[PDB]
Coordinates of C-alpha atoms in Angstrom, one line a residue:
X9 CA -11.8 8.0 -5.0
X10 CA -9.1 10.6 -4.6
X11 CA -10.1 11.8 -1.1
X12 CA -11.4 8.4 -0.1
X13 CA -8.4 6.5 -1.2
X14 CA -5.9 9.0 0.3
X15 CA -7.7 8.5 3.6
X16 CA -7.5 4.7 3.1
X17 CA -3.8 4.8 2.4
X18 CA -2.8 7.1 5.3
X19 CA -4.8 5.0 7.7
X20 CA -3.1 1.8 6.7
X21 CA 0.4 3.2 6.8
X22 CA -0.3 4.9 10.2
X23 CA -1.6 1.6 11.4
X24 CA 1.5 -0.1 10.2
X25 CA 4.0 2.4 11.7
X26 CA 2.1 2.4 15.0
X27 CA 2.1 -1.4 15.2
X28 CA 5.8 -1.8 14.4
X29 CA 6.7 0.7 17.1
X30 CA 7.4 3.8 14.9
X31 CA 5.9 7.3 14.8
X32 CA 3.0 8.3 12.5
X33 CA 3.5 12.1 12.9
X34 CA 4.5 12.7 9.3
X35 CA 0.9 12.6 8.3
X36 CA -15.2 5.0 0.3
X37 CA -13.2 5.1 3.6
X38 CA -15.9 3.4 5.7
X39 CA -14.3 2.3 9.0
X40 CA -15.4 -1.0 7.6
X41 CA -13.0 -0.8 4.7
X42 CA -10.2 0.5 6.8
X43 CA -10.6 -2.2 9.5
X44 CA -11.0 -4.9 6.8
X45 CA -7.8 -3.7 5.1
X46 CA -5.8 -3.6 8.4
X47 CA -6.7 -7.2 9.0
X48 CA -6.0 -8.3 5.4
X49 CA -2.6 -6.7 5.7
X50 CA -1.7 -8.5 8.9
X51 CA -3.0 -11.7 7.5
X52 CA -0.8 -11.1 4.5
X53 CA 2.4 -10.4 6.4
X54 CA 1.7 -13.5 8.4
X55 CA 2.0 -15.8 5.4
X56 CA 4.6 -14.3 3.0
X57 CA 7.1 -12.8 5.4
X58 CA 9.8 -11.9 3.0
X59 CA 8.9 -8.2 3.0
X60 CA 9.4 -7.6 -0.7
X61 CA 13.1 -7.6 -0.1
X62 CA 13.9 -7.6 -3.8
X63 CA 11.3 -5.2 -4.9
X64 CA 12.3 -2.5 -2.4
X65 CA 15.9 -3.3 -3.4
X66 CA 15.0 -2.6 -7.0
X67 CA 13.6 0.6 -5.7
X68 CA 16.1 1.7 -3.1
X69 CA 14.0 4.6 -1.9
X70 CA 15.9 7.9 -1.5
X71 CA 14.7 11.5 -1.3
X72 CA 15.5 11.9 -5.0
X73 CA 13.3 9.0 -6.2
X74 CA 10.6 9.9 -8.7
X75 CA 7.0 8.6 -8.9
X76 CA 7.8 6.9 -12.2
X77 CA 10.3 4.5 -10.5
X78 CA 7.8 3.6 -7.8
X79 CA 5.3 2.9 -10.6
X80 CA 7.6 0.6 -12.5
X81 CA 8.4 -1.5 -9.5
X82 CA 4.8 -1.8 -8.3
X83 CA 3.7 -2.7 -11.8
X84 CA 5.6 -5.9 -11.1
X85 CA 3.0 -6.9 -8.5
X86 CA 0.4 -6.6 -11.3
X87 CA 2.1 -8.5 -14.1
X88 CA -0.9 -10.7 -14.6
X89 CA -3.4 -8.0 -13.9
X90 CA -5.3 -7.0 -10.7
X91 CA -7.1 -9.0 -8.0
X92 CA -7.9 -8.5 -4.3
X93 CA -4.9 -10.4 -3.1
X94 CA -2.5 -8.2 -5.0
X95 CA -4.2 -5.0 -3.9
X96 CA -3.5 -6.2 -0.3
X97 CA 0.2 -7.0 -1.2
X98 CA 0.3 -3.5 -2.7
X99 CA -0.7 -1.8 0.6
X100 CA 1.5 -4.1 2.4
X101 CA 4.4 -3.1 0.1
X102 CA 3.9 0.6 0.7
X103 CA 4.0 -0.2 4.4
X104 CA 7.3 -1.9 4.2
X105 CA 8.7 1.1 2.3
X106 CA 7.7 3.5 5.0
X107 CA 9.3 1.4 7.7
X108 CA 12.5 1.2 5.6
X109 CA 12.4 5.0 5.1
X110 CA 12.2 5.5 8.8
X111 CA 15.2 3.1 9.5
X112 CA 17.2 5.1 7.0
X113 CA 16.4 8.3 8.9
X114 CA 14.2 9.6 6.1
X115 CA 11.0 10.2 7.9
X116 CA 10.3 12.9 5.3
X117 CA 9.5 10.2 2.7
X118 CA 6.5 8.5 4.3
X119 CA 4.2 11.3 3.4
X120 CA 5.5 11.2 -0.1
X121 CA 5.1 7.4 -0.3
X122 CA 1.5 7.9 0.8
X123 CA 1.0 10.3 -2.1
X124 CA 2.5 7.9 -4.6
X125 CA 0.3 5.1 -3.4
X126 CA -2.9 7.2 -3.6
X127 CA -2.0 8.3 -7.1
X128 CA -1.2 4.7 -8.2
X129 CA -4.5 3.5 -6.6
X130 CA -6.7 6.1 -8.3
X131 CA -4.9 5.5 -11.6
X132 CA -4.4 1.8 -12.0
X133 CA -6.4 0.0 -9.4
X134 CA -9.7 1.9 -9.0
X135 CA -10.7 0.9 -12.6
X136 CA -10.6 -2.8 -11.6
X137 CA -12.0 -2.2 -8.1
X138 CA -15.0 -0.4 -9.5
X139 CA -15.6 -3.1 -12.1
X140 CA -15.6 -5.9 -9.5
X141 CA -17.8 -4.5 -6.8
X142 CA -16.0 -1.5 -5.3
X143 CA -14.7 -1.6 -1.7
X144 CA -18.0 -3.2 -0.6
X145 CA -17.0 -6.4 -2.3
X146 CA -13.6 -6.1 -0.5
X147 CA -15.4 -5.8 2.8
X148 CA -17.7 -8.7 2.0
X149 CA -14.6 -10.7 1.1
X150 CA -12.3 -9.8 4.1
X151 CA -14.6 -9.6 7.1

């Protein structure tokens, strides 16, 4: 959990910043889970290409933004509960936030956004993930 998930989140965001041409300096984690997640996220951005334009707009991330605001907006993704597809959208959403932070010359926030995601993960998503197989089922599902 905690340590595992934090590693999982920082890997995905680093992977995203790197891929999009940005720096990544500001920073059960089996390489299998990590690789599977990177792929799932690319797959995801391939289809729905909006980039949560309205979510991040409801958020409007600034250095003064508190975790509670992040949580309210992300809860939107989970209106009808949790599932693998939404967990991927979730990582994908955090990724878009980091990119936006960097374009607003607020590199400082990407490490914060990683904390928020890990907290949210451990808090609201782990419960369901553990109940449906753990990250192993994720791996089995996203080769």
